[PDB]
C-alpha cells in the first residue's frame, strides 16, 4: 500500500545517502545462472546489484538532493550497482563481465558527488 | 435405487408439486446446496444418476447428503388398454420436489470442485437448479 | 467444424466470437471449431 511504498522510498533514499558509488545497467539478455555468477564473483557486502523501480529510483534521487541523473532514468531499463568504500574494483568486475557477455548497454551512474558520461564509465574502470 | 421397504397403500393419490417450499429449504448439513426453481416429479432413477455423478466427480475426502427421498409411488396402465377396470399397478417411485427445496448438498472439498459437482448433479435432473451457500 | 446446440471453449486457447449474428468458437486446433451456439 501507500505506507509500504513510503517505507521503501525512505530506506532506499537513506541507503543512497550513506553510500559512495552508483552505476546503472540494463537487464537485456543475460541468464539467471549468469546473475547468480555475478553475485558470487562480487562476494562483497559493499557491492550490491539490485532491480529497482524506475519511479522509485527517481523519487529517492529527488529526496537525495542530487541532480543531473534524470537523463539516465528516462525511457530506459535501469539497474542499480551500489558500492561501499571501494567502487573501482566493482566497476572493473562488471566491465569484464559485460565484455564476457554477448551484448550489453551501459548508462551513466553517480559517484563521489559527481556524475559521469558513457565514455567516462569506460575509463572509470 | 432408493425405494421404501414397505408401504401401507400400494396406490396412493399423486402429491402436487405446485407451491412454495415445505421443509428442506435451507442448507443445514453441508454448506453448498443445489436449490430447485421449478417444482417437478423426479424419480429414484434420476437420484441415482445424480448421486453417482456426484460420487464420481467427488474426491477421496468429500462428503455428501441427499435430502429428498422418493416416498410416493406412481402407477402406469399397461399399453393398448382401454380406460376402466381399475387403477394401474405401481411402476416407479418419485420424490416430490417443490420450488425451493435443496436436493443435494456437499462439503469438505474446495469450492471449485463442489461447484462443478453440483453442476453435474443438476444437469441430470429436470428441475432448473441453482447454487446456494449456508448462512454463517 | 462441429455444429452443436451449446458451444463452450475446449482448451484455454479457444476464443468465442460472434460473426454474422452467430456465435462460433475459433482456435489454433481445427478440431475445435464450433458453431450454432
Amino acid at each position: 500500500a501507500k505506507k509500504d511504498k513510503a517505507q521503501q522510498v525512505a530506506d532506499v533514499s537513506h541507503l543512497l545517502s550513506t553510500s559512495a558509488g552508483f552505476v546503472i545497467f540494463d537487464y537485456t539478455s543475460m541468464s539467471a545462472i549468469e546473475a547468480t555468477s555475478i553475485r558470487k564473483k562480487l562476494f562483497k557486502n559493499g557491492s550490491k546489484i539490485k532491480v529497482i523501480k524506475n519511479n522509485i529510483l527517481r523519487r529517492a534521487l529527488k529526496a537525495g538532493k542530487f541532480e543531473g541523473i534524470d537523463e539516465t532514468a528516462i525511457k530506459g531499463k535501469l539497474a542499480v550497482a551500489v558500492g561501499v568504500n571501494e567502487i573501482v574494483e566493482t566497476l572493473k568486475a562488471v566491465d569484464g563481465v559485460v565484455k564476457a557477455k554477448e551484448a550489453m548497454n551501459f548508462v551513466c551512474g553517480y559517484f563521489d558527488n559527481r556524475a559521469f558520461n558513457s565514455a567516462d564509465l569506460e575509463k572509470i574502470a | 435405487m432408493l425405494q421404501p421397504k414397505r408401504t401401507k397403500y400400494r396406490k396412493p393419490h399423486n402429491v402436487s408439486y405446485e407451491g412454495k417450499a415445505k421443509g428442506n429449504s435451507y442448507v443445514a448439513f453441508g454448506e453448498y446446496g443445489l436449490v430447485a426453481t421449478k417444482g417437478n416429479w423426479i424419480d429414484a432413477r434420476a437420484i441415482e444418476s445424480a448421486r453417482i455423478a456426484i460420487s464420481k466427480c467427488l474426491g477421496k475426502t468429500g462428503k455428501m447428503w441427499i435430502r429428498i427421498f422418493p416416498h410416493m409411488s406412481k402407477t402406469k396402465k399397461p399399453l393398448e388398454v382401454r380406460m376402466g377396470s381399475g387403477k394401474g399397478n405401481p411402476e416407479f417411485w418419485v420424490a416430490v420436489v417443490k420450488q425451493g427445496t435443496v436436493m443435494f448438498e456437499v462439503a469438505n472439498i474446495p469450492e471449485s470442485q463442489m461447484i462443478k459437482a453440483l453442476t453435474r448433479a443438476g444437469h441430470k435432473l429436470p428441475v432448473t437448479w441453482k447454487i446456494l451457500k449456508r448462512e454463517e | 467444424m462441429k455444429v452443436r446446440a451449446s458451444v463452450k471453449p475446449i482448451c484455454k486457447d479457444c476464443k468465442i466470437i460472434k460473426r454474422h449474428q452467430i456465435v462460433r468458437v475459433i482456435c489454433k486446433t481445427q478440431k475445435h471449431k464450433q458453431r450454432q451456439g
Binding site: 545462472i33 547468480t36 553475485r39 558470487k40 562476494f43 | - | -
Partner: protein, 128 residues
C-alpha cells in the same frame, strides 16, 4: 549446449556428439583424463556445443539423495512421507553440504545445510 550422461570410466561411445561436429576421437582423451580421481562413479558432463570447435567441457557431481541413503543406513526411503524411518544428524548433513557445495549455486554454507534438509524431507528422513 548439451548435458550428456557419460560414465567416468567409460565415455568413448556416444553418436550424438558426432551430429554437432565435435572431434570425438581427439576429445575422448580429454574426457577420460580428468575423471580418474573419481573412477567408478557416474559423472555427467556439460558441453558448450558450438561451431567454435574448441568445445570446453565441465564435469558434474553424482546426483543428490544417494548419500542421504548411505548416511541413513537404509537402501530405499519410506514410501509414505508421514512414515519416518531414517534419522540424520547435523554432522552428516554438513559433510554432505561441503561435498555438494561444488555443484550448488548458493552463496553461503547454511543455504547448503538446509538443502540437505529439503531433500531429506523428500526422502522422509527426520532432521535431528
Amino acid at each position: 549446449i548439451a548435458k550428456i550422461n557419460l560414465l567416468g570410466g567409460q565415455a568413448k561411445p556416444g553418436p550424438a556428439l558426432a551430429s554437432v561436429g565435435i572431434n570425438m576421437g581427439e576429445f575422448t582423451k580429454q574426457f577420460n583424463e580428468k575423471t580418474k580421481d573419481k573412477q567408478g562413479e557416474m559423472i555427467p558432463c556439460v558441453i558448450t556445443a558450438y561451431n567454435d570447435k574448441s568445445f570446453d567441457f565441465i564435469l558434474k557431481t553424482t546426483p543428490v539423495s544417494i548419500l542421504l541413503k548411505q548416511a541413513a543406513k537404509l537402501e530405499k526411503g519410506a514410501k509414505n512421507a508421514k512414515t519416518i524411518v531414517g534419522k540424520i544428524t547435523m554432522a552428516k548433513a554438513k559433510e554432505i553440504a561441503q561435498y555438494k557445495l561444488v555443484d550448488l549455486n548458493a552463496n553461503t554454507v547454511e543455504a547448503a545445510l538446509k538443502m540437505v534438509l529439503g531433500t531429506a524431507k523428500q526422502m522422509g528422513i527426520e532432521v535431528i
